[PDB]
Amino acid sequence: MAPRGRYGPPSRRSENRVVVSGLPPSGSWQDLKDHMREAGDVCYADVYRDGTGVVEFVRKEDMTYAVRKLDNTKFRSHEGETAYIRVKVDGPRSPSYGRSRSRSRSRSRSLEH
Fold first, then answer.
1. Residues spanned by the domain of 59
2. For residues 26 and 69, is the Cβ–Cβ distance under 8 A?
3. Which subcellular locations apply to this protein?
4. Helices (H) and strands (E) in the chain, counts
5. How far apart are CA 67 and CA 18, in angstroms?
6. 3-class DSSP state for residue 88?
7. Residue 36 near residue 70 (C-beta atoms within 8 A)
8. How many Å apart are CA 109 and CA 36, to the nearest integer?
9. Based on the structure, what is the number of domains in the chain?
């Protein structure tokens, strides 16, 4: 629950993307962006039919702002239906195989470094 800045020297940065949950029966990513736009300048936004979605901002400023200020906000669909949505910064999440990601992995036993 509590992040940190000492464990592994980053070397990717990534575009930074967050995930949303609480989309209506008749909604789309394009419609979500218009709502998240309040956070700042959106660069990308997608929404799965499962119910959850994802949004991407230019600078982290809009990211942290959205997950903070735009956290648990009532979403509005062009159809005329509201829906409680929640934003969160994409973190330790991988339905795929387990693989020690935030554990340790022992280390010091590879053929490189």
1. 11-100
2. no
3. Cytoplasm; Nucleus speckle
4. 2, 5
5. 8
6. strand
7. yes
8. 45
9. 1
